[PDB]
């Protein structure tokens, strides 16, 4: 096959995968638009000859799509595999996986921290740290990856801010004093103190192609002078320590008044003479500067703009960046030695079993294991290519394998297949490099399996390896809340549609596309620009026709706030066995306990009621006798049983408890409201009378019957909705401030904070919003701002919306906006006309 | 002429009418319109800013720095109207 | 712009619609996929460029490299070896580039035209025939300024 022009041999990068030490799997990631795409430009002109950047334009080499281009933005996460050299020279294989710093496609990250070791942090230093960073140092840290952080930009410190050098260093300590700050809240491991000592931050500027380390600076000393560890040179480059000229030594105390710090004095005011010969005093003093640093330049290149000059003397100057490669070595593991935290986090089954100590080990033969994440397209969109990494064994093209789906088990049997593997490709941005081997520990393309897998897959081998279980679903960092509903323009062309929803299913992990009851077709999404990719994706490359798309509205979710006033009982239509119910809400906090896994299901009774009867003081009568939480083992409910032994023989209750736990969790999904799922809700069990045949306790009676329980006990306790709302960061000028609070002042939010950035004249404000109210807002601040102020918005949690849904002494007069205790009203007569359900649903209708 | 029902913009919104301009730091400047009606009409705050956040020698260097500049503004002007002048100067 | 009937389905049901903010021209050209319906002939818009935080400078008197207090001030607040293991460097060994100046005359205008507009960040091109040079094209193409008449908007 043809491949362009390499600085390496591709048999050398062949017979490289085979050692799974001298290989690492690093995801980068960071906030939108802080240097990522473009540092993997500089990686891929530093692996390539012939491939160059622009004079007038960036390259964005890994980013191919069309979208990706015209929007100026990341969509779609997109891996390359390279070989780098370090500092002293050896040669090592990196599979590097560009992640979009957005905060609407963070799915896009989840699916890329699965399957990687390492995490690469970029932050602005001009801005600090923002909101997808705070989110993505939790979110790497709940995944129990390895964290670095490379600070990008710092030529804004230079050439934008125009700041004094130990103010600069300041602005540098304050961005890693918060990183270390951001992760000794989350993380429980003392050992993760991020500075620049430990050789674990990286200082980088992308568009001028600056990369170091204090050891590859240290290093380019030992190279220009000679005769100097440079490793125990580059221990003593930050902080307060001075070097003192009259003894050559480094000392904590001041010699002078005016003696600069070693960091300020050895490297950062070289680079800003550097900048400062190269910009400002190109015709008077440049070559005798360009004479005394070594570095030689023709003719030609010295009647170069300023851009390009500064950048071609900075890469003479720093040449290859062998830093970040001695940063992704030292501080990420690799996947023979890292092997065994992502079996025990991912791998469903535990690492105790047998096929786990074999996955353990990285063993290149033996059982075939690999996990596929991500589903790319081709260019014809007929067919896509699944793309995992290899846990265990060696794939091979033409082999039959065996595809697991997420809704395998060895006891059902019933999601999996045997496909063919077509082809296997190692992938680089815009090219990918066919192979018909590859061992563990690397990542595969594989063609032909694309059929069985929707989200994400499994591959083992069809004979052998029965115990086979499949590895955890991709537990994304959000909630979709923005319901959208489709229809075709022509209606005989549905059929045609209903094939490009579930293509658009495979390439988009967080993405959920159902069907309602009235047969409306729903596509949830996280904010506006993910579903216009959706749409655009969609429409352009699996539908060619025109799609209708009406009005986007929020998912809503249903409440109580009292305790009902009358026990609720039903019995069974056979008319042997009766069910009585109160239900009660939950105390304050214990819903997001629960939504956090502090709280959990499987217990063995002891440590589970002493978190109840230790922290929320509950009843040890309660905290002894939970059956079940929400409509998942993770959702906020609980089912509480209150009776009594002695009252109801318990030994009788404990054989119906199985059929009441499926109505309670069949119960709890599809609200008697309008048809949705129940937050902050306790269940309690009063009075029940079990029959005695065992004929008369099948689960056809009791199961719709407890369903009724549920919904009587629902509509008696004072039931109430819940709507969704948005966290808000704004970056605006120091006079917009005011006017973004004449904004937020219309959409029924409240600003909770006003900060300061510190190094530089921009503010922070971060408020809530309704997200229901948050269509449009960012056009709102970017027209009312003159496009200076912008702001990005995550989902954050839910609460109650005020009014009675009711009160149906409320008349509603349509197309217009209705104040504050019609909005509850409003919405549940709305969402019940949308769903299909009766105009109103009474109080004794169960 | 043209027609004034050809004319865009006419919407009632709060949010577009007063579409709130920027200043760009007190600093940057609209071209061609005139620079001393600029800083009349400014909002005045980030002149607060300034004299909040200058050093206390720097507020003796602003106004060092406008004396230079009325210096040179009076050196300029030494293009008045006849009816202010005399006739040896004339 | 001159121009390049619709019938009540279940589909468009203001029963469904919640009405609560009033829906502009400038959401449907923002994002022209998600509101708009039959969206046949749109072109994807730029999203966001970073906030470009150059100040400019009033007095040539200070030095180019300065501290604008425009710019917020930073709050004030390791493992650093001990004195005890004394490294020390050869006599030869020297800072790079200490006897060049930190800033000269020609620091902050070479700053300075790094930001200018076409042409003027420029340092080498070809020239150009003088009607091909439209000076007003920038004075229409910002905005309309406020307080001016109607048939200057028009
Ligand atoms: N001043 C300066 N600008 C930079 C630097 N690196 C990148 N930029 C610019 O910032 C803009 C965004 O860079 P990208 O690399 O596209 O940002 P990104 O991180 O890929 O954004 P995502 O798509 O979220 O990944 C471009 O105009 C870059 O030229 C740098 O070192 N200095
Ligand atoms: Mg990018």
Known sequence: ?846 | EWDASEDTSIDYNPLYKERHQVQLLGRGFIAGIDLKQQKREQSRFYGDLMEKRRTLEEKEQEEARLRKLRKKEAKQRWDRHWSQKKLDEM | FEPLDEDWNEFNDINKIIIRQPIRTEYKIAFPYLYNNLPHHVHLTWYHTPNVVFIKTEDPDLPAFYFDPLINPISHREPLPDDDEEFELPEFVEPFLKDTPLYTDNTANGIALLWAPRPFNLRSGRTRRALDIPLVKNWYREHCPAGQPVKVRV
């Open chain 1, 1 to 846: 096959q043809t491949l362009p022009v390499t600085v390496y041999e591709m048999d050398f990068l062949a017979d490289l995968m085979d050692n799974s030490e001298l290989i690492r799997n690093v995801t980068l990631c960071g906030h939108l638009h802080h240097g990522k795409t473009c540092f993997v430009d500089c990686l891929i002109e530093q692996t390539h000859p012939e491939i160059r950047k622009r004079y007038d334009q960036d390259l964005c080499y890994t980013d191919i799509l069309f979208t990706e281009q015209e929007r100026g933005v990341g969509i779609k996460s997109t891996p390359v595999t390279v070989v780098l050299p370090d500092t002293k020279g050896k040669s090592y294989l990196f599979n590097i996986m560009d992640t979009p710093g957005h905060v609407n496609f963070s799915d896009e990250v989840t699916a890329g921290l699965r399957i990687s070791d390492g995490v690469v942090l970029f932050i602005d230093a001009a801005e600090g740290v923002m909101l997808n960073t705070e989110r993505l140092i939790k979110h790497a840290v709940q995944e129990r990856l390895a964290v670095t952080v490379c600070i990008n930009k710092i030529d804004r410190l230079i050439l934008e801010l125009k700041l004094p050098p130990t103010d600069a260093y300041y602005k540098l300590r304050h961005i890693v004093d918060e990183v270390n700050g951001l992760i000794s809240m989350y993380s429980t491991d003392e050992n993760l103190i991020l500075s620049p000592l430990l050789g674990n931050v990286c200082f980088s500027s992308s568009q001028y192609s600056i990369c170091f380390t204090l050891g590859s600076f240290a290093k380019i000393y030992a190279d220009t002078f000679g005769d100097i560890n440079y490793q125990e040179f580059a221990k003593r480059l930050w902080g307060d320590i001075y070097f003192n000229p009259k003894t050559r030594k480094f000392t904590k105390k001041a010699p002078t008044s005016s003696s600069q710090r070693s960091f300020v004095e050895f490297i950062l005011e070289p680079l800003y003479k550097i900048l400062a010969q190269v910009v400002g005093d190109v015709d008077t003093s440049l070559p005798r500067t360009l004479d005394e640093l070594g570095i030689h330049l023709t003719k030609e290149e010295l009647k170069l703009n300023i851009r390009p000059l500064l950048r071609l003397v900075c890469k003479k100057f720093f040449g290859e960046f062998t830093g970040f490669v001695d940063m992704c070595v030292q501080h990420i593991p690799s996947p023979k030695v890292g092997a065994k935290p992502k079996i025990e986090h991912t791998y469903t089954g535990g690492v105790d079993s047998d096929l786990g100590e074999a996955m353990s080990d990285c063993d290149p033969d033996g059982p075939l294991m690999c996990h596929t994440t991500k589903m790319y397209s081709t260019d014809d969109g007929v067919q896509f290519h699944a793309f995992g990494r290899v846990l265990s064994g060696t794939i091979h093209a033409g082999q039959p394998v065996k595809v697991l789906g997420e809704n395998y088990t060895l006891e059902d049997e019933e999601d999996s297949q045997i496909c063919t593997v077509g082809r296997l490709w190692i992938s680089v941005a815009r090219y990918h490099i066919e192979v018909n081997r590859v061992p563990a520990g690397n990542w595969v393309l594989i063609e032909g399996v694309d059929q069985p897998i929707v989200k994400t897959a499994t591959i083992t081998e069809p004979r052998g390896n029965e115990e086979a279980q499949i590895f955890r679903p991709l537990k994304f960092n959000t909630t979709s809340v923005i319901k959208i509903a489709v229809e075709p323009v022509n209606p005989s062309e549905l059929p045609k549609m209903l094939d490009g929803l579930r293509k658009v299913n495979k390439s988009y992990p967080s993405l959920t596309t159902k069907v309602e009851e009235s047969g409306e077709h729903v596509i949830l999404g996280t904010g506006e620009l993910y579903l216009d990719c959706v749409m655009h994706d969609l429409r352009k490359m699996y539908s060619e026709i025109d799609i209708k798309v009406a009005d986007p509205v929020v998912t809503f979710c249903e409440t109580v706030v009292e305790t009902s006033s009358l026990k609720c009982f039903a019995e069974t239509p056979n008319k042997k066995n009766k069910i009585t119910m109160i239900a009660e809400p939950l105390e304050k906090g214990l819903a997001e306990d629960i939504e956090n896994e502090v709280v959990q299901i499987t217990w063995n009774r002891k440590k589970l009621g002493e978190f109840f009867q230790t922290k929320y003081d509950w009843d040890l009568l309660a905290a002894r006798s939970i059956w079940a939480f929400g409509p998942d083992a993770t959702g906020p409910n609980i089912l509480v049983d209150d009776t009594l032994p002695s009252e109801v023989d318990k030994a009788l209750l404990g054989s119906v408890k199985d059929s009441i736990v499926q109505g309670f969790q069949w119960g709890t999904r599809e609200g008697p409201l309008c048809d949705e799922l129940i937050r902050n809700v306790k269940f309690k069990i009063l009075d029940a009378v079990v029959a005695q045949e065992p004929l008369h306790r099948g689960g056809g009676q009791i199961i719709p019957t407890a369903r009724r329980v549920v919904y009587s006990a629902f509509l008696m306790a004072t039931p109430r909705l819940m709507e969704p709302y948005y966290f808000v960061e704004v970056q605006a000028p120091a006079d917009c401030v005011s006017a973004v609070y004449t904004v937020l002042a219309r959409r029924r939010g409240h600003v909770t904070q006003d900060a300061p950035i510190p190094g530089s004249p921009l503010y922070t404000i971060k408020a809530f919003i309704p997200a229901i109210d948050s269509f449009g807002f960012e056009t709102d601040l970017r027209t009312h701002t003159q496009g200076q102020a912008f702001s990005l918005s995550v989902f954050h949690h839910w609460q109650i919306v005020p009014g009675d849904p009711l009160d149906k002494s409320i008349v509603i007069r349509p197309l217009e906006p209705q104040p504050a205790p019609h909005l509850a009203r409003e919405f549940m007569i709305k969402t019940r006309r949308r769903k299909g359900l009766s105009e109103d649903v009474s109080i004794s209708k169960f």
